[PDB]
Amino acid sequence: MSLDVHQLSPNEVALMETLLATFGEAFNDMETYTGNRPRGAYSRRLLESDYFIALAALEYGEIVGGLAAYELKKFEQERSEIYIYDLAVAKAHRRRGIATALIEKLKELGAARGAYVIFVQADTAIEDEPAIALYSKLGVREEVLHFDIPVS
């Protein structure tokens, strides 16, 4: 395997755009991830922010997977946690340890940031158990309730 797990820099908005296409195909929601892409300026400032983390997995120059996460600096104590928002690997490239490699990279990035934990919500439907099997091996599962409150 020639896998390269790479943290996107502010100098790599172009890579972020391709990663969005990887997310779209993997989530079967191309319209959401590529239908109204941000401007380079917006994407750039996000990449040079203190809390946003974008990882890309590459094979011979091709993006085959990636991860988007947010570092949450806490208020009750001097500590931080990393929230994995999106994580995806291209279909032809799955069951090969790419997602594991991405999370392993996020761990060593987290330890360098002083974060004490990484957490991620797993959807529960039929499409999910590959991710659930992935998350169950790395962390501790707990069943919670999620609510989407609308904003006008």
Ligand X SMILES: CC(C)(COP(=O)(O)OP(=O)(O)OC[C@H]1O[C@@H](n2cnc3c(N)ncnc32)[C@H](O)[C@@H]1OP(=O)(O)O)[C@@H](O)C(=O)NCCC(=O)NCCS
The answer to whether 25 contacts a copy of itself (rule: CB under 8 A) is no
123 contacts: CB under 8 Å, gap ≥ 6: 131
What's the min distance (Å) between Cβ of 99 and ligand X?
3
b (16+ CB within 10 A) / e for 24-57: bebeeeeeebbeeeeeeeebbebbeeeeebbbbb
Amino acid at position 110, single letter: G
| 3-class SS of residue 10 | coil
Nearer to a copy of itself, 4 or 48 (CB): 48
> Taking phi first (over 0 means left), then psi (-120 to 50 degrees means alpha), and beta for anything else, what does residue 61 get?
left
Nearer to a copy of itself, 7 or 60 (CB): 7
Amino acid at position 132, single letter: I
The C-alpha atoms of residue 65 and residue 59 are separated, in whole angstroms, by 9
Which residues 97-136 are close enough to bind ligand X by CB under 6 A?
97-100, 120, 122, 128, 130-131, 133-134
Size of the site for ligand X (CB under 6 A): 21
Out of a copy of itself, ligand X, none, which partner does residue 88 contact, by CB within 5 to 8 A per kind? Answer: ligand X
The C-alpha atoms of residue 124 and residue 127 are separated, in whole angstroms, by 8
37, 44, 96, 107: which one contacts ligand X (CB under 6 A)?
96
The answer to whether 20 contacts a copy of itself (rule: CB under 8 A) is yes
The answer to whether 53 contacts ligand X (rule: CB under 6 A) is no
Report the interface residues with a copy of itself, using CB under 8 A: 16, 20, 23, 32-34, 36-39, 42-43, 46, 49-52, 54, 68, 70, 72-73, 75-78, 82-83, 85, 103, 107, 110-111, 115-124, 128, 132, 135-136, 138-152
